[PDB]
């Protein structure tokens, strides 16, 4: 009979388990025997307190490096303001030691945990690449609670070295099964930011994770976008509980918050899932998340049923992670077929945007070719356009099965006249749909201003397979 942790703050970890059902169903995974043994997670952040009483037992120097100072030791830099506490808080969410009379427990409290010290310094492209590419045959899962500025006017993503690190990781990492990159979708909610303007979250190679409050609401900091895949609990208003984890200076905190707390909880759940089936590929893991995540009782005004009967929201992706369901489905999972890529250049001429532009195109999705896709995974609309005030644009993409993805919502602070230069807006909302048929792109001016610009390129990029479908939900 499984015995739950006795740690002093475990009763305050409301998001791990409870009678109430407002949790991530993590105790159910523990009771199936999965606690993370043998899985290696690295926190890419501002360092990790490797001697913390709730981390030392799980600490893994092979999962760690200091990119900022170019040494093996990721110890945080101690300051009066405790600026470099962030990575230690994230690490405890994944892998804080259980049943040791200290603080609470990690989701994967028997996993090995490391940290890359890379945020405490200039975060260049090379710095990101060296962190994302660290020991990729030892580290299984990388967790990143950072990214481009959430001011609601930035469009930015991985530069060349970092993107090369993503492709090398998913292609050759973890013995060719592919590194698992987990990303926090962003804190730009107050600025009406869109997490599709962040190339890290918008990447197909990352599992972008959003947040829900204890009472099941969209937190103030949350960013909505179509690239988000799923959700874990985090902080909300001051009547709602927060996240319990290891803090800097060997302390315990019950007030870890924001998007930063959601990605590590997802990384811990993915660690449990990898223990249940170490042969899962990076794409397998995303399929598992899509199939098992739970919308129920998460409040949003945009819940929609996609072409295969799954509920999807721009605030939550496919909903809350469910650790018990993840580890159960993982055990007899059949590896997905190799990923196909079908490139469809849509436009035959540039199109003036004006007040509203609609582009309709019927595609065959590479019918008759080895990259024929009947089972969609990610879809991208790679757009090149000029516009005088970027944040007045709203962009939607409708799949042949009728699923409307918001690629870009209005961003009031985005005054840029720089437009989009082949920006690969991504949606997860048509996962498992047949992409043959009519796709519709809509670009509209959401303001009364007399704005102007031109769409000069629209590449529809479809990823997926041609086999293995389930009967729709």
């Amino acid at each position: 009979v499984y015995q739950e942790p006795t740690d002093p703050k475990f009763p305050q970890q409301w998001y791990l388990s409870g009678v109430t059902q407002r949790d991530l169903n993590v105790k159910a995974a523990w009771a199936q025997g999965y606690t993370g043994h043998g899985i290696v997670v690295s926190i890419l952040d501002d360092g990790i307190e490797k001697n913390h009483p709730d981390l030392a037992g799980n600490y893994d120097p092979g999962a760690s490096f200091d990119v900022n100072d170019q040494d093996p030791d990721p110890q945080p830099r101690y300051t009066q303001m405790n600026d470099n506490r962030h990575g230690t808080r994230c690490a405890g969410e994944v892998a804080a030691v259980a049943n040791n009379g200290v603080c609470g427990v990690g989701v994967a409290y028997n996993a090995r945990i490391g940290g890359v010290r890379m945020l405490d310094g200039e975060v260049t492209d090379a710095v990101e690449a060296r962190s994302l590419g660290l020991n990729p045959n030892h580290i299984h899962i990388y967790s990143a609670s950072w990214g481009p500025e959430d001011d609601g006017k930035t469009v930015d993503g991985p530069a060349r070295l970092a993107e090369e690190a993503f492709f090398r990781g998913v292609s050759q990492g973890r013995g060719g099964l592919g590194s698992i990159f987990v990303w926090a979708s962003g804190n730009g909610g107050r600025e009406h930011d869109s997490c599709n303007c962040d190339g890290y979250t918008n990447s197909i190679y990352t599992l972008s994770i959003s947040s829900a409050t204890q009472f099941g609401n969209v937190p103030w900091y949350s960013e909505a976008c179509s690239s988000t895949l799923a959700t874990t609990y985090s902080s909300g208003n001051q009547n709602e509980k927060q996240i319990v984890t290891t803090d800097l200076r060997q302390k315990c905190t019950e007030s870890h918050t924001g998007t930063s707390a959601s990605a590590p909880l997802a990384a811990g759940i993915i660690a449990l899932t990898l223990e249940a089936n170490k042969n899962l590929t990076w794409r397998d893991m995303q399929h598992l998340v899509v199939q098992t995540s739970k919308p129920a009782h998460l409040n949003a005004n945009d819940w929609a049923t996609n072409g295969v009967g799954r509920k999807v929201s721009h605030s939550y992706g496919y909903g809350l992670l469910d650790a018990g369901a993840m580890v159960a489905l993982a055990q007899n999972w059949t590896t997905v077929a190799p990923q196909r890529k079908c490139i469809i250049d849509i436009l035959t001429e540039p199109k003036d945007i004006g007040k509203r532009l609609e582009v309709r195109k019927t595609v065959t999705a590479c019918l008759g070719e080895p990259n024929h896709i009947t089972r969609l995974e990610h879809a991208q609309a790679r757009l090149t356009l000029s516009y005088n005030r970027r944040g007045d644009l709203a962009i939607h993409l409708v799949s042949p099965m009728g699923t409307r993805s918001t690629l870009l919502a209005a961003r009031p602070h985005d005054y840029s006249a720089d437009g989009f230069n082949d920006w690969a807006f991504m949606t997860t909302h048509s996962w498992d749909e047949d992409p043959s048929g009519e796709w519709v792109l809509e670009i509209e001016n959401t303001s009364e201003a007399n704005n102007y610009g031109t769409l000069t390129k629209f590449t529809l990029v479809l990823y997926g397979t041609a086999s293995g479908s389930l009967v729709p939900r």
Partner: peptide, 5 residues
């Protein structure tokens, strides 16, 4: 910074 926590 180019990237934020």
């Amino acid at each position: 910074r180019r990237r934020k926590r």
